[PDB]
Amino acid sequence: LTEELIKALQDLENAGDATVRQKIASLPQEVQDVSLLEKITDKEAAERLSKTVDEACLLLAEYNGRLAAELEDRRQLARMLVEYTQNQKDVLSEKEKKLEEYKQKLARVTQVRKELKSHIQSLP
Amino acid sequence: LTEELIKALQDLENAASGDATVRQKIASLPQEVQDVSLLEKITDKEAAERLSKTVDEACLLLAEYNGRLAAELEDRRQLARMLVEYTQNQKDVLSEKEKKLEEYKQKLARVTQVRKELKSHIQSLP
C-alpha cells in the first residue's frame, strides 16, 4: 500500500512535456486560422501550408493523448491519497489509545517497584 | 514536495516492524510485575530480589517504548497534515491541467478546420 503510493508518486513526477509544448507553440498562425486561407493563391503555397498543417495534427494528437493520460494518472493518485489518509487516521487513533494503555501499565509497574522496596524490608 | 512526502512515508514505514516486536515483549511480562496485590506471595528476600530485577527491566522497557510511541504519533500527525496539503495541491494542479487540455483540444479542432478547408481550397487553384 505504502510501496504502491510511493511508486505512483515517483511515476507521476517522472512524466519533454515542455519541449513538446514549445514545438506546438512555434507553429505559425496560418495552421489554425481559416480566415487567412485567402492568402493562398497557388498550389506551391498551399502545399507548403499543407505540410505544416499535417505536422500540427500529429503533434497535437500525440500531445493531447499524453496530457489526457496524465490527468487519468492524477485522478487515480487522488483516489489513492484519500484512501491512504483515511487508513492513517484510523491507525493514528488506535495508537493514541495504545499509548494511554501503556502509560497506565508503566504506572502499575512503578507502583509494584515502590511497594516491593517496602515489602522486602519485612522479609528474611 | 513529492520528494518530501515520499521520505516521510518511507521513514514511518521503517519503524513498524520494530514496534510490534517491542509490544510483544511487553505483553510477555508476567502478572507479578504489574499487580501489587500479589506481593504477599513473596516470602523471602531472594524471590523479592528476583522480582525486583524483573520489575526494573520492565520499567526501562515501558519507559523507552512510551517515549518511542509518543514520537511516532507526532510523526503521524505530521504525515496526516502533509497528506491533506498534498491532496489539496493535486486538486489545484488537476483543474489547471484540465483547463490546458481543453485549450489544446480546441487548438487541434481549429487545425482540423484549416486542414479540411485547405483541401477544398486547393481544388479551386490552378
Indicate which CATH number applies to the domain containing B36: 6.10.250.2560
Pick from B5, B39, B125: which is nearest to A115 by CB? B39
- Phi, psi (rounded to 5 degrees) for B23: -60, -40
Tally of structural domains, chain A: 1
The set of residues, in sequence order, having a beta carbon less than 8 Å from that of B65 and lying 6+ positions away, is A102, B22, B23, B26
Distance, in Å, from the CA atom of A118 to the CA atom of B57, rounded to the nearest integer, reads: 19
DSSP string, A42-90: SHHHHHHHHHHHHHHHHHHHHHHHHHHHHHHHHHHHHHHHHHHHHHHHH
Domain that holds residue A112: 1-124
For cell 489539496, what's the residue? B88
Quote the cell numbers at residue B51. 522480582
Judging contacts by C-beta atoms under 8 Å, the chain A residues touching residue B32 are 112
For cell 511497594, what's the residue? A115
Expressed in Å, this structure's resolution amounts to 2.2
Amino acid in position A6: I
User: In this complex, do A112 and B36 lie within 8 Å of one another by their Cβ atoms?
Assistant: yes
Burial of B34 (0-12, 13-18, 19+ CB in 10 A): buried
How determined?
X-ray
Judging contacts by C-beta atoms under 8 Å, the chain B residues touching residue A103 are 66
Quote the cell numbers at residue B74. 507526532
Burial of A12 (0-12, 13-18, 19+ CB in 10 A): middle
User: In this complex, do A123 and B56 lie within 8 Å of one another by their Cβ atoms?
Assistant: no
Identify the closest residue of chain A to B83 by CA–CA distance: A85
Size of interface A-B (CB pairs under 8 A): 179
- Long-range pairs of A88-93 with CB within 8 A, sequence gap ≥ 24: A88/B76, A88/B79, A88/B80, A88/B83, A89/B80, A91/B76, A92/B73, A92/B76, A92/B77, A92/B80
Identify the closest residue of chain B to A88 by CA–CA distance: B80
Pick from B9, B36, B80: which is nearest to A92 by CB? B80
Distance, in Å, from the CA atom of A66 to the CA atom of A13, rounded to the nearest integer, reads: 14
Quote the cell numbers at residue A87. 487508513
Quote the cell numbers at residue B47. 524471590
Q: After which residues is chain B broken (C to N over 2.5 A)?
A: none
